[PDB]
Amino acid sequence: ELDQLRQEAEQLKNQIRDARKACADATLSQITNNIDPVGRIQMRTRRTLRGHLAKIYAMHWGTDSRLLVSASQDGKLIIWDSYTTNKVHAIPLRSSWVMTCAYAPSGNYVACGGLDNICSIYNLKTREGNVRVSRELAGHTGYLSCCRFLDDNQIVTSSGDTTCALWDIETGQQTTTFTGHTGDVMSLSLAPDTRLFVSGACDASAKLWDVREGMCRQTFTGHESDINAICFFPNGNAFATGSDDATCRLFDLRADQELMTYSHDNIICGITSVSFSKSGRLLLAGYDDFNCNVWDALKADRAGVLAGHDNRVSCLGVTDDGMAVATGSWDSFLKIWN
Amino acid sequence: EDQRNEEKAQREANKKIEKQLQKDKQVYRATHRLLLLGAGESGKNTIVKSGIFETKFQVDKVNFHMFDVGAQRDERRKWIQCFNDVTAIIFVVASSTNRLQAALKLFDSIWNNKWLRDTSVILFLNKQDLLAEKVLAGKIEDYFPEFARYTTPEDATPEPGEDPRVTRAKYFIRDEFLRISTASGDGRHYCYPHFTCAVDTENIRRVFNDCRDIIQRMHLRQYELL
């Protein structure tokens, strides 16, 4: 009977494959074959933030596109004011193995988690004026790879136990559990409307969930190795994934298929970070060869290089207004490019 | 004016945070974190001395942080990269399915990893008494066919002197690890193998000496002497 179920699943996968093949009629490159190229744009290191001791695993921009938060393996969480290159709120962490950090949309809270299998929520503004652990969430049996604030009262986390969880910060309990990933989830990205979110895991698959009840609407399988980073298109109808097979891919919703892959022959290092520009024309991908490649998302031709680091980048982000891009690195340096 | 006022307030807050941060840097520099890794749960990592476990111990007024992985899945492909900056990886192997082959494969994967290529390994061979009991009693020979051709090295220095067969087996296992260590990498990181009987307190001294040698080699590499 197990063999019968395996045959049933294989037949269903084949049927989905034929449905996708019938859906595809013309590649995205053919559509954007007459589009004027970007023009080989170059961006210099506008600023360098150098307050961390150990490698920087994650950083997240604020809503105002002025304040950012960075987490480093020296157990440090620093909120930089990028305009005046100043720093505020150097938050010490209970566990020094933080691997992710998030900034609340309202700007009132900061999340961080790591090898402790726990997500700590810190209240930025207090009557005492000192940042303290507002709440500790521990519903994960594996390391927290990513976390994102939903509405300043709910948080979505992905862990190394192959599960995602939507929490309630007030009650400190798991509200919803998203399951279906084989490999541990490495990254997640919220939709602009906060109605859906995509998650990329250690398997080649990426799954799209809806936070209201979380039943894994769609699954995309185009990569060949672990999906390290995921980012969501500004219009909300597409997303981009970066994997360890040294390729980036652009999937789209409501078509359940690949659109275009970004890769080069002389690239043999995996992707660690992926982000989109304000209009979505540019796709910024961080690499393991200490460089950041800026791709024309419509033509899959390299448009820029951002080689300002000494070690792997491991994190990058673009401001809400698209003014500047911040890249962290394992050399304990943050760089703001514009 | 508001703008100079808030700029001054932000600058003084930055100065205070800078003071606290240099104070924290002083503590962080003199710590020498280590990663205590074991092939399986059978290995007696605990007596060597959720999510992650911390152990603080001082040797000759030198602080040491040992991190033991707890509530994590068996797939260590991703989170092991968090330990590329540790001073050493204390790899504990029970020298008593073929668990030895699994330990060898794990050691090879750790040694040949791209991000751990600069991290040194302190190899501990536990279950020495168990290995002696198994060797004297009438599974090592069949698991490793090359053991028959193996001969005890000249610098065996068998201090316990329990048998000329136990020493041969333990040195065969040590050479099995050293083959990978020497072949895969040269001039970047070093492997320090030791025999432990799990009833001795000298393990922390051996770890201290190996860490001293590791940092000496790292400093020597700055001048390209090594």
Partner: nanobody, 128 residues
Framework: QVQLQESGGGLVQPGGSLRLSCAAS????????MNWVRQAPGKGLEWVSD????????SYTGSVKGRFTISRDNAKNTLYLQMNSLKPEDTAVYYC?????????????????????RGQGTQVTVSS
């Protein structure tokens, strides 16, 4: 998607010969190092052998060193394991595993349970 399908191997008399063929799809075969692992009844996954890209770095576990041989055809996108002298204690489910990262001399967690880039496996039983 990454799909590894193993074929061959049934009931074989002790001392007999067998051939296991692993067909791979969804990735560039030549970029990855391949592995053969096995799981005995009630024993857990154990590593049997591995071969690097384009061969030339073959290695086996000690138990099967003199008997089993592993080869690969990059053009045919296939992995082969020949078992020329079977013994009763190697009755197991055999899996074709593809290591997680391309262009890597190291590769992790093939023997770990719930591993993504592993096939369904074939039963190989040796008995009278």
């Amino acid at each position: 998607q990454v799909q590894l399908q193993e074929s061959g191997g049934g009931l074989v008399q002790p001392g007999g010969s067998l051939r296991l063929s692993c067909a791979a799809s969804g990735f560039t075969f030549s970029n990855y190092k391949m592995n053969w692992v096995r799981q005995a009844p009630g024993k857990g996954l154990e590593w049997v052998s591995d071969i690097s890209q384009s061969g030339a770095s073959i290695s086996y576990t000690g138990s099967v060193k003199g008997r089993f041989t592993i080869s690969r055809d990059n053009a045919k996108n296939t992995l082969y394991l020949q078992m020329n002298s079977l013994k009763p204690e190697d009755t197991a489910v055999y899996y074709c595993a593809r290591c997680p990262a391309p262009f890597t001399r190291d590769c992790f967690d093939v023997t770990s349970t719930t591993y993504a880039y592993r096939g369904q496996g074939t039963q190989v039983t040796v008995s009278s």
